[PDB]
Design a protein around this ligand. Structure first.
Ligand code: SAH
Lengths: 439, 117, 395, 362, 606, 42
């Protein structure tokens, strides 16, 4: 026997939330400090009014006290290389990523290539220069990112501005290790001009014993819950893929986890796109139609106090997707209005009456033809009452008058009226009307 | 409810489980989040970068970290040598503008190419 | 292309996150009510007038939307909403049948992208411009049932624009004045205060062009009838003053974020402050007198932002939305406030709770001026949501 | 003609396989690639010569304990790609493109489990599906639409587990649990009108859903041909090749000897048997058979793996052939046979998840 | 028995005769095989197909599963990581069914014609279930174990082994071949063979069609004999699928005074308006120049029974007849035939001031006391024999049902009701039809308006919907409890109509026979309809069958009689909004209900 | 009787308790342990 089935069953809940840890830490769907039971965080009480005439003066004072960075022209002189040759450099200006830009665009500005010593030895020095133009202006360089420098011999890169647009460099000799293709390097200079326990429950005959550490931090979403009650409540709220039951450990608390028995609400988007083939499913390139639904989960919670003893959904809409009864085919929301797929005269019974009438022995097609056609008509309109059939005969003649006139079946059709009157269904006057309309 | 209520169709199909499974392998063999990253943080490994000589005898050092998710390379003091070899940055203090590059399932624009704006 | 595989995987991820958010709603919100629509709406602006029926514990609200139909005729729509207007308003809380109604539906040529009503007369709403012409609709005259006999024959249409636009704002101080943006790099001025003649077409009063890229929003100042700010995609917003008789010389030469900026809004309870949001994943506020100086920028979003809303019930409460699939409320009172590392790692101190009740881009959102805290948010996924914070964060 | 082989395979998952079909649409000189179905994995295989069988990437529906019973090859008219259609016990038909190694289309609508499928030899985008709910589903792959059903009580009254087209693709013969053998004619005007409308339907084009129809009434029915459950059918010109667990394959046609196969009305119920073959140990059902493309030779698997091979000619069925080929290690059951475009390669299925390849000595 | 050997020898002689037929057919079909396979091969050679690439692995294979295929002989165990194709939301189990909005009687032949498949595992532990299943019909199977089936000549020659001794020979042949199985049918078969014909696919009296070229004169009853034997009065449709043909013909009286034949000149072509002809007609109240053909005589013999009085209409109907010759032909026929009685009754006394109330009061005592203790509700069966006029031998009386219009009782029989007196939506306790748990039949209930606004499907008269067939809009969707479910797209109020649980009307015995396999298959569809019929909906029906049952259902199903037929009606127990699965209590036996339908939707919430 | 029998379709015929490192034992079940406690977590 193997327990790999248990691990596989619990791994799907595991890795999902483990990746959601990174996703939410980078991009929180909600602030954890703002949770009602996580409210021990966010100690900044809302008590201030913050009149709009205090931040402008403070910002002006900060701007006056700021502006630490200063600049005039950037210059640099090359010393040489070293290996265990003419050199080319470039100037790059980077603009921040715009809507039409997949990433931040980079635009390069050429300069004058020069020559550098081909890995000179010690004391070999006995003039190459490159100067930058003072083209940095607030209007011209408003949209650009921090500038950078290109070096090629064997390519290297290094920026100039810091995060706050301040100068990151200085006038001095630089020893740069070159990222070719100790080791390759280049020389030059620059110038200016409590304890808890865990348990896993599934097929409880046997299980893998577990222990717990970092108690206040969730094993999955690594959230530091400073309140023991709030830890279990957050586990319940954010980890429906597990069922937690609390037992008081002799040396603290204990939580036993178990895979969810039902775990409903797996999909909540447009139900029409659940069964659709790939490519056309979850497209969202253009608007898609879905049935109107209304769902409410919070109206006015009682807001009870944080009580440990507590540990031991309205919806009016179509919601689920509807399928065609005849074909078990999913129904389009736009086709939903008229796709009743049920009417009084199914085609199969239309063929059934024909086949059964024609199949019988002691009767010929000369009479079976009208015997078949009358059934077709009456079952097409589904007459029930006697006064309904009095006009059912009339509607039969109305539907098939030209066809019978071109067919000349009046004498055979007369047998139908005789049977009608023998059952008192068709009156004497209605007998003639089936004849005048026949021609 | 009752004893044998059926389980609704799980929208998280098995191939997505395989994708997250392989992501777990790559992140366990690349950054060691559980051990080195302490679960909630990502370790950044610095390398040997250029050293600049200031007016004083001490040389201002430069360090660029291997993951290079969103941080720009910034100059450091001489004491940073052998002290800032490995740093651990929590996912929260990583920049909120360009840190998505570590893995593109962490965040992406769902409409991607938008027919409308 | 590996984009489709990642898109499907992240679709399942966003489904999982939506589920997790949904089960966390009772201990996060005082009110969660999500709705689905037949067609998506790109406009979410609460009507100012809200009726309060007596006896029952809920009030009747009205909300302006717009059908974005990709197959059939689009319709201008006004949807009513019931909200628990009672202290003890605990099926749901009120009538269990009509918490969402579609009572008003008006034919529209093309979909609605950014609809903004009149403060002076909410019956008049402009559907912006999925065309070269801006249409005017008076929902009182139009029938409740949408007649499919072509367009609803809008009362007035405005000339001046060439391509589509997503910026719209009516003058809060002067009657019948509108400004709107477009991809034509231009903002057009309209005077809808007096249309006595026939034709039912009002030309642009004055064309405004001072930006080198696409303009995407424009708004008037609430305490300044003549001073109105404009924002464009050339990493530059610009404040314009009328009566200057110059269509290219701004009143104050100013510059916006380092990247594309798409929204601009003023706070009603002040004379100077102004806020805007850009595609640089940042929302920054400016001042009418401190133009050059930078007060603060908000760095909670991760994608482009094209909607900003000052809370009408407060002076220091702001909100913004974007393609980040998140809705952020800003409390300027707590700007730069010191907090413990647990509070900081969740988010910046000035950032209030980040709403996450959506599966697509939040097309538009607004706060109703009747309840002290009330806000809806729409999306292209037809996900209509009205949400409220738990009182614990603002007492 | 005599087959010899020293080779065998076995899949690790060990549950029984339920069908193999060769990619007859492969061009001249292409490697012999055939599909295998069963055990929640679609295992494609490649064969060139010398007994070597090369696997292709298997597609597994690990979302549930699905059991697979169906493989069927086809080609895309628009892009000239080899497509494979797979259906299983879940009543779900899956279309997987091996060129991209990823599925493209799935189909839902089956009320119960699905047995083996066959593709239309004339229109590649048409797929006929048997079902456990006494129904017959035909599909239009080019538009993903559902076309007329053959599922009424007037059709089969129990579990349908076999269907086939003729050589020209004009009539359909199927058999079920109720021993019935019924004929549906594709060449009937209603049917090609429905097919043409299926190729002409796009969901975005119109709001009205594609109006399919129900074909309850076949053009023939019979029960006395086999006293047991008939589980496999094939077409031999106008004749029917049917097998039931009376340990005998039989040949017969509707109507009398001179009765036309096209003018025979459904009222006529005359059945004439003009051929029968015998073998041993046909106790367990689902023991299907198939011919080569040229129909010159026939084989049928056995539960001990005996392969009774017979060459088909104009000779008398009584002494048509008495050739049997068997390997000492093929004692497991066999439930499906398949041939290449030529008679060179014969490959069958087994119960212990083993695959056997038989080589023709031509 | 040697009968089988003799049959085999005769079949061998026939096969020797047909050895050329089989050879020629095989050759001809092999020609078509070649000519229709060569074209397919050439079509395949015409176009090109992209070959499949070799096995490859993606970078995600490290976390993905890997499979291996081993070989019995010396071949490498090739391995390949699996490709997890995207899953789909499979629909729940369902069984195909022909849609209809009415019922369909199914013959009760005790032939299995299949053996349903079973798990094949419990049979090894206990395979007695299939034995119990087949023993209910008889310890047999379709085809039995005879293993014998030959041609007609071989079967006849099987008796030829003992034919020189016939009854014993035919019995031996029947024992040899189960196709016939009886020596008695051999007499009819031999009579047909000696006649070298059959009754024929036509009237047996040498006439293919009465309206066909064989325009033979026939009597009135023979012409309508095939017509009336295949005409069902109940459903009004020829060859009914839910009523038997064991009924008397249309031997009923009629309002003979309707055919007044008012005195009016019919022109020169008139059996009247001629002194001798008019005098003869008055007495019956020159010879024809044109002799009427056989068709004219046959149609006259039929139309006389309907239109005795006026000759003009009869002449107008018969093409081969003239009204001027009508008098002469009538004289000749009455000389060669006999007239008809055309019975009618007067019944002068009548009173409806209080007699309706008195009869209604009388019906209540029977239906409560005399019908509540019967413990059975027999299926409606009209009585058409005067052997018990409102007595204890009329099927409508012993079954305690009502001798309605469809019963051949007296026109003023007290065993019938005058319909709905009330106009108050026919569903309150004041409605006699609702009181008698039966839908009001429109031709009698002129108050509630069931016959009013026939084209309207929104009748203000509740408790007549099944007669109108105006079912509400219902939508199929998977059920959260088990299998499929039925969901309504519109709100439903108190006691509003939902579609009838349509199915197959079959006898109690046949329904119990089907229940034996339904219990094993777990997907049962049988709860009793009446003491004679039980509705089976596994083969035919509609979306109603998908409605499940819970301890607190949202609907109620009352088995109720409509127009002489019992129909299972569905009505909502409480107001149900859009998008809720319909549940109605099955009135199911508690033990077997908890065994079958024991799944509950909502637990003990309070 | 031979045709009445049911169609059977076939022939008759590391243990010690572990901390949250055990969680790290189940996402990367292969491709190295990534921590020494996974071996103790097996
Ligand atoms: N509430 C319930 N829970 C489980 N099974 C149910 C049920 N209601 C009905 N059934 C089963 O379904 C059959 C009645 S027909 C009910 C609907 C249909 N069978 C379906 O599955 O879609 C019975 O045989 C019973 O066993």
């Amino acid at each position: 026997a193997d327990h790999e089935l248990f691990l596989q069953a619990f791994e799907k809940p595991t890795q999902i939330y483990r990746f959601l840890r990174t996703r939410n830490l980078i991009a929180p769907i909600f602030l954890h400090r703002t949770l009602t039971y996580m409210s021990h965080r966010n100690s900044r009480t809302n008590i201030k009014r913050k009149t709009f005439k205090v931040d402008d003066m403070l910002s002006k004072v900060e701007k006056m006290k700021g502006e630490q960075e200063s600049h005039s022209h950037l210059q640099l002189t090359f010393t040489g290389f070293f290996h265990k040759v003419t050199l080319e450099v470039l100037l790059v200006k980077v603009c921040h990523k715009k809507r039409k830009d997949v990433s931040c665009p980079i635009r390069q500005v050429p300069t004058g290539k020069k020559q550098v010593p081909l890995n000179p030895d010690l004391n070999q020095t006995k003039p190459s220069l490159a100067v930058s133009s003072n083209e940095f202006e607030p209007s011209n360089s408003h949209m650009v990112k921090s500038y950078s420098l290109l070096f090629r011999v064997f390519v290297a890169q290094m920026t100039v501005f810091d995060k706050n647009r301040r100068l990151q460099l200085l006038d001095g000799e630089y020893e740069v290790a070159m990222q070719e293709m100790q080791g390759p390097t280049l020389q030059f200079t620059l110038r200016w001009t409590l304890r808890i326990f865990y348990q896993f429950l599934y097929n409880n005959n046997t299980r893998q014993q577990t222990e717990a550490r970092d108690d206040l931090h969730c094993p999955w979403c690594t959230l530091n819950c400073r309140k023991l009650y709030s830890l279990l409540k957050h586990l319940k709220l954010c980890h429906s893929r597990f069922i937690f039951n609390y037992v008081y450990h002799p040396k603290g608390a204990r939580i036993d986890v178990s895979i969810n028995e039902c775990y409903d609400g797996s999909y909540a988007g447009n139900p029409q796109d659940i069964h659709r083939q790939p490519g056309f499913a979850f497209s969202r390139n253009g608007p898609v139609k879905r049935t109107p639904i209304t769902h409410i989960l919070v109206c006015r919670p009682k807001r009870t106090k944080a009580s440990m003893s507590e540990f031991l959904t309205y919806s009016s809409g179509h919601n689920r997707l509807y399928f065609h009864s005849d074909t078990c085919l999913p129904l389009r929301p736009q086709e939903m209005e008229v796709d009743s797929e049920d009417e009084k005269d199914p085609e199969w019974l239309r063929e059934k009456t024909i086949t059964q009438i024609e199949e019988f022995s002691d009767v010929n097609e000369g009479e079976k033809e009208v015997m078949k056609l009358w059934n077709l008509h009456v079952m097409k309109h589904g007459f029930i009452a006697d006064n309904q059939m009095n006009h059912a005969c009339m509607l039969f003649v109305e539907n098939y008058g030209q066809k019978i006139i071109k067919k000349n079946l009046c004498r055979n059709f007369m047998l139908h009226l005789v049977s009608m009157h023998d059952f008192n269904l068709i009156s004497i006057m209605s007998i003639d009307k089936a004849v005048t309309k026949l021609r | 409810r009752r004893r044998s209520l059926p389980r609704p169709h799980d929208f998280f199909d098995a191939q997505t489980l395989d994708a997250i499974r392989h992501r777990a392998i790559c992140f366990n063999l690349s950054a060691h989040i559980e051990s080195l990253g302490k679960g909630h943080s990502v370790v950044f490994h610095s390398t040997v970068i250029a050293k600049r000589k200031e007016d004083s005898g001490k040389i201002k050092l430069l360090l660029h970290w291997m993951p290079e998710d969103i941080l720009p390379d910034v100059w450091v003091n001489e004491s940073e040598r052998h002290q800032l070899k490995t740093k651990v940055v929590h996912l929260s203090k990583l920049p909120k503008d360009t840190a998505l590059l570590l893995d593109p399932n962490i965040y992406r624009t769902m409409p991607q190419k938008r027919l409308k704006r | 292309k590996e984009a489709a595989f990642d898109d499907a995987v992240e679709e399942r991820v966003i489904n999982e996150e939506y589920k997790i958010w949904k089960k966390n709603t009772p201990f996060l919100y005082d009110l969660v009510m999500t709705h689905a629509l037949e067609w998506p709406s790109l406009t979410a602006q609460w009507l100012p007038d809200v009726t309060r029926p007596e006896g029952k514990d809920f009030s009747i609200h009205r909300l302006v939307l717009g059908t974005h139909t990709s197959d059939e005729q689009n319709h201008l729509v006004i949807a009513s909403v019931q909200l628990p207007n009672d202290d003890a308003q605990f099926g749901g809380f009120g009538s269990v049948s009509g918490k969402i109604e579609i009572e008003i539906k008006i034919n529209h040529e093309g979909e609605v992208n950014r609809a903004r009503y009149m403060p002076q007369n909410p019956c008049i709403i402009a559907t912006k411009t999925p065309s070269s012409d801006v249409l005017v609709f008076d929902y009182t005259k139009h029938p409740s049932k949408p007649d499919p006999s072509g367009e609803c024959n809008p009362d007035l249409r405005l000339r001046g624009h060439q391509k589509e636009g997503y910026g719209l704002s009516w003058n809060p101080n002067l009657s019948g004045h509108l400004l709107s943006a477009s991809d034509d790099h231009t903002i057009c001025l309209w005077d809808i205060s007096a249309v006595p003649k026939e034709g039912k077409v009002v030309d642009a009063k004055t064309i405004f062009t001072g930006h080198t890229a696409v303009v995407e929003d424009v708004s008037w100042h609430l305490l300044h009838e003549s001073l109105f700010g404009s924002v464009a995609d050339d990493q530059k917003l610009m404040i314009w003053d009328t009566r200057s008789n110059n269509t290219s010389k701004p009143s104050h030469s100013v510059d916006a974020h380092t990247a594309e900026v798409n929204c601009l809004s003023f706070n009603p309870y002040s004379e100077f402050i102004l806020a805007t949001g850009s595609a640089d994943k940042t929302v920054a506020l400016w001042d009418l007198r401190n133009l050059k100086l930078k007060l603060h920028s908000f760095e909670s979003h991760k994608d482009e932002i094209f909607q900003v809303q000052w809370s009408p019930h407060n002076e220091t409460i702001l909100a913004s939305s974007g393609t980040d699939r998140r809705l952020n409320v800003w409390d300027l009172s707590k700007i730069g406030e010191e907090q413990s590392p647990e509070d900081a790692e969740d988010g910046p101190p000035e950032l209030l709770f980040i709403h996450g009740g959506h599966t697509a881009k939040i097309s538009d959102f607004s706060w109703n001026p009747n309840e002290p805290w009330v806000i809806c948010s729409v999306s292209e996924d037809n996900i209509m949501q009205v949400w409220q914070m738990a009182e614990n964060i603002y007492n | 003609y005599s087959f010899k082989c020293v080779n065998s395979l076995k899949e690790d998952h060990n549950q029984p396989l339920f069908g193999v079909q060769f990619n007859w649409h492969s061009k001249e000189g292409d490697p012999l690639v055939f599909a295998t179905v069963g055990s929640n994995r679609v295992t494609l295989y490649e064969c060139h010569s010398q007994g070597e069988i090369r696997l292709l990437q298997s597609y597994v529906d690990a979302d549930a304990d699905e059991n697979f019973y169906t493989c069927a090859w086809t080609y895309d008219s628009n892009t000239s790609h080899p497509l494979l259609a797979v259906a299983g016990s879940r009543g779900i038909i899956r279309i997987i493109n091996p060129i991209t190694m990823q599925c493209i289309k799935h189909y839902v609508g089956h009320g119960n489990a699905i047995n083996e499928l066959k593709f239309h030899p004339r229109d590649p985008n048409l797929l006929l599906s048997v079902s456990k709910d006494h129904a017959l589903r035909l599909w239009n792959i080019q538009t993903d639409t559902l076309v007329a059903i053959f599922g009424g009580v007037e059709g089969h009254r129990d579990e349908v587990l076999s269907a086939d087209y003729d050589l020209l693709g004009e009539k359909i013969m199927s058999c079920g649990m109720d021993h019935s053998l019924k004929l549906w004619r594709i060449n009937s005007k209603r049917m090609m009108n429905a097919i043409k409308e299926s190729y002409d339907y796009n969901p975005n084009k119109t709001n009205r859903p594609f109006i399919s129809q129900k074909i309850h009434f076949p053009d023939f029915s019979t029960r006395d041909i086999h006293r047991n459950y008939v589980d496999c059918v094939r077409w031999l010109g106008d004749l029917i090749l049917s097998k039931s667990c009376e340990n005998a394959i039989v040949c017969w046609k509707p109507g009398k000897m001179e009765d036309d196969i096209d003018k025979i009305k459904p009222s006529e119920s005359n059945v004439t048997i003009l051929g029968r073959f015998d073998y041993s140990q046909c106790d367990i059902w689902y023991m299907r058979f198939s011919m080569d493309f040229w129909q010159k030779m026939l084989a049928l698997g056995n539960q001990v793996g005996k392969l009774y091979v017979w060459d088909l000619e104009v000779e008398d069925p009584h002494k048509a052939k008495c050739t049997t080929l068997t390997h000492h290690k093929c004692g497991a059951a066999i439930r499906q046979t398949s041939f290449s475009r030529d008679s060179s390669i014969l490959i069958a299925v087994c119960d212990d998840a083993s695959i056997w390849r038989w080589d023709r000595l031509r | 028995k040697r009968v089988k050997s003799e049959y085999m020898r005769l079949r061998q002689l026939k096969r020797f005769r047909r050895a050329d037929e089989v050879k020629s057919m095989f050759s001809s079909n092999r020609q078509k095989i070649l000519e229709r396979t060569e074209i397919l091969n050439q079509e395949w050679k015409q176009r090109r197909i992209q070959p499949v690439h070799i096995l490859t692995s993606v970078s995600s294979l490290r976390g993905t599963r890997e499979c291996s295929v081993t070989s019995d002989l010396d071949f490498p165990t090739q391995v390949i990581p699996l490709k997890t194709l995207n899953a789909v939301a499979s629909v729940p189990i369902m069984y195909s069914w022909s849609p209809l909005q009415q019922n369909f009687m199914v013959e009760d032949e005790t032939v299995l014609h299949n053996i349903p498949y079973m798990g094949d595992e419990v049979l090894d532990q206990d395979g007695t279930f299939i034995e119990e299943l087949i023993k209910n019909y008889d310890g047999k199977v379709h085809g039995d174990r005879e293993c014998g089936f030959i041609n007609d000549e071989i079967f006849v020659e099987l008796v030829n082994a003992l034919g020189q001794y016939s009854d014993k020979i035919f019995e031996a042949i029947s024992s040899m071949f189960p196709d016939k199985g009886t020596a008695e049918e051999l007499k009819e078969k031999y009579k047909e063979l000696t006649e070298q014909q059959l009754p024929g696919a036509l009237p047996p009296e040498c006439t293919p069609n009465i309206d066909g070229p064989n325009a033979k004169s026939v009597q009135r009853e023979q012409s309508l004999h095939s017509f009336h034997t295949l005409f069902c009065r109940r459903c009004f449709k020829y060859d009914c699928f839910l009523h038997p043909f064991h009924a008397t013909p249309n031997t009923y009286k009629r309002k003979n005074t309707e055919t007044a034949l008012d005195n009016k000149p019919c022109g020169p072509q008139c059996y009247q308006h001629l002194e001798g002809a008019k005098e003869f007609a008055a007495a019956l109240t020159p010879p024809e120049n044109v002799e009427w053909s056989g068709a004219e005589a046959s149609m006259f013999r039929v139309l006389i029974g309907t239109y005795y009085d006026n000759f003009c209409a009869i002449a107008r109907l018969i093409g081969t007849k003239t009204c001027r010759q009508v008098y002469e032909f009538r004289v000749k026929e009455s000389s060669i035939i006999a007239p008809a009685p055309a019975e009618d009754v007067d019944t002068p006394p009548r009173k409806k001031k209080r007699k309706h109330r008195l009869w209604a009061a009388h019906c209540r005592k029977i239906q409560l006391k005399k019908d509540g203790s019967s413990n059975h509700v027999y299926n409606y069966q009209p009585c058409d024999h005067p052997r018990q006029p409102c007595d204890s031998s009329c099927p409508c009386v012993i079954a305690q049902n009502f001798c309605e219009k469809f019963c051949q009782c007296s026109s003023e029989c007290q065993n019938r009701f005058p319909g709905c007196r009330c106009k108050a939506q026919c569903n309150t306790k004041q409605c006699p039809c609702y009181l008698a748990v039966r839908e009001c039949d429109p031709d009698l209930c002129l108050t509630c308006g069931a016959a009013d606004h026939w084209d309207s499907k929104n009748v203000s008269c509740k408790n007549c919907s099944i007669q109108r067939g105006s079912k509400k809009h219902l939508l199929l969707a998977p059920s959260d409890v088990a299998g499929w479910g039925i969901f309504i797209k519109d709100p439903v109020q108190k006691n509003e109509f939902i579609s009838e649980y349509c199915g197959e009307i079959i006898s109690q015995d046949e329904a119990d026979r089907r229940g034996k396999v339904y219990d094993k298959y777990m997907c049962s569809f049988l709860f009793n309809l009446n003491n004679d019929f039980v509705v089976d909906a596994t083969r035919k029906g509609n979306k109603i069958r998908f409605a499940n049952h819970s301890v607190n259902p949202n609907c109620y199903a009352k088995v109720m009689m409509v127009n002489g037929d019992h129909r299972i009606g569905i009505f909502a127990k409480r107001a149900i909004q859009t998008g809720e699965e319909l549940f109605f209590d099955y009135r199911y036996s508690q033990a077997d209900a908890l065994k079958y339908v024991g799944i509950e939707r909502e637990m003990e919430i309070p | 009787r031979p045709r009445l029998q049911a169609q059977r379709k076939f022939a008759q015929s590391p243990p010690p308790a572990t901390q949250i490192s055990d969680l790290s034992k189940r996402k990367p079940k292969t491709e190295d342990f990534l921590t020494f406690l996974c071996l103790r977590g097996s």
